[PDB]
Design a protein around this ligand. Structure first.
Ligand code: BEF
Ligand code: BEF
Ligand SMILES: [Mg+2]
Ligand SMILES: [Mg+2]
Lengths: 129, 132
């Protein structure tokens, strides 16, 4: 299959570089942005197969960024992109809030190639590495 | 004590990943985008120390993308970002067209890690790699 086009969103530069490097080495075409504000702007510009969205970010958090994307998708009329929460905060009540905000799934930090590969396959049908 | 923040722009995924990888290994915080259109929008949004701009891209080429950035900097009233052409197409007349378009300098493909560090030091005063 063709390489998946993936967006990674994280306010922690080390966390962002880690997920971006794992996905790029698995053969994905990766865009990486440092904020929810950037996530909205780049999802308007580019068509991604899937978005990895950090939850805790200042100003606009992951849930607010996903709501912004869902509002723009409905108003602009664009096929919805799968949004996967990728966070250190994934308790039962936090999971519920993420799905309520319009996210599709969640992974817990720290990430690994196996978790990324399986979630991309589940939601896009595209394989990695 | 933050590392240099660098933008790379290239419509060829393999070319883009190569320059992105070399700059990341040198210890820069690197953003990589696939078009001139993307270059304009991300330069409005984020503060880069320097941009590496591919020339040949469909719709908006690197020269048109540099002019777009320079027009936005002037109207918005923002400190200009250095823009370095990173291209396979560097004939005498092409080099002159790049400078005419508002690009500061050029490097020829295939790129090398030493030239990249030098260009960053020249245009930003920031060091990389062992001297970061
Ligand atoms: F800043 Be996070 F939700 F890992
Ligand atoms: F598409 Be280029 F100017 F290497
Ligand atoms: Mg965070
Ligand atoms: Mg090109």
């Amino acid at each position: 299959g063709r390489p998946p086009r993936l967006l990674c969103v994280d306010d922690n530069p080390a966390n962002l570089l880690l997920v971006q490097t794992l996905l790029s080495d698995l053969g994905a075409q990766v865009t990486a942005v440092d904020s929810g504000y950037a996530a909205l702007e780049v999802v308007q510009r580019e068509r991604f197969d899937l978005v990895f969205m950090d939850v805790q970010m200042p100003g606009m958090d992951g849930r607010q960024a996903t709501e912004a994307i869902r509002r723009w998708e409905a108003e602009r009329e664009v096929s919805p992109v799968p949004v996967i929460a990728l966070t250190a905060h994934a308790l039962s009540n936090e999971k519920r809030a993420l799905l309520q905000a319009g996210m599709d799934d969640y992974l817990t930090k720290p990430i690994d190639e196996q978790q990324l590969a399986q979630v991309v396959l589940k939601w896009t049908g595209l394989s990695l590495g």
